[PDB]
Amino acid sequence: VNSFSGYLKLTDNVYIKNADIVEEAKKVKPTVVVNAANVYLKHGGGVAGALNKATNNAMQVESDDYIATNGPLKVGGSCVLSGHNLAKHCLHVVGPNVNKGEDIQLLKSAYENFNQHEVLLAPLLSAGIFGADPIHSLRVCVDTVRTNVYLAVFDKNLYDKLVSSFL
Numbered sequence: 001v002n003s004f005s006g007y008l009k010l011t012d013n014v015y016i017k018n019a020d021i022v023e024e025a026k027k028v029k030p031t032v033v034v035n036a037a038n039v040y041l042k043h044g045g046g047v048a049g050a051l052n053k054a055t056n057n058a059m060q061v062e063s064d065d066y067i068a069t070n071g072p073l074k075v076g077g078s079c080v081l082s083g084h085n086l087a088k089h090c091l092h093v094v095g096p097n098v099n100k101g102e103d104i105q106l107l108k109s110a111y112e113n114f115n116q117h118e119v120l121l122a123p124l125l126s127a128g129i130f131g132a133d134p135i136h137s138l139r140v141c142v143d144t145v146r147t148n149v150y151l152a153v154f155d156k157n158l159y160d161k162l163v164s165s166f167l
């Protein structure tokens with residue numbers, strides 16, 4: 001039993017809800033919140049901009065030190081950093097950004113990072129300003145993640161479309 005509430009069960013291990021991941025994280029304080037990161041950990045907009053703003057820019061300060069030490073992530077890769085006031089940990093995961101021309105096949109590699117964590121609160125990777133089809137992202141999630149994933153979908157219209165079309 002965990003503290004996640006109001007989710008629709010899609011499969012044995014994948015759940016979905018119309019929710020703002022920022023507000024959901026603040027309420028649940030999950031062990032792991034997933035950020036929709038870029039390789040530079042520049043948290044300017046989309047989910048990343050919202051998560052960072054909620055940390056009062058502490059996420060960005062920590063991230064800049066991480067990049068100064070380690071260099072950029074790989075597309076499809078991840079790193080574990082602090083969850084600040086939102087979660088114990090933040091798993092920064094880089095899905096391909098279609099608006100940059102990145103290979104959509106890397107979306108599966110991106111979701112594989114979730115399997116290193118028993119339970120996660122997450123957005124759909126590569127959705128939103130990353131330009132991928134969210135229906136495809138949900139399919140890859142379900143077919144790749146084996147650990148327990150709680151998906152927060154901000155847009156109510158998109159959430160209903162994702163549910164109604166789920167096979």
Ligand SMILES: C=C(Br)CCC(=O)Nc1ncnc2[nH]c(C)c(C)c12
Binds near residue numbers: 047123128
């Ligand atoms: C937004 C659209 Br159109 C479709 C993608 C989507 O639902 N992305 C998200 N999913 C969950 N929490 C979220 N918080 C914020 C700020 C975003 C962007 C977000």
Ligand SMILES: [Cl-]
Binds near residue numbers: 046
């Ligand atoms: Cl985004």
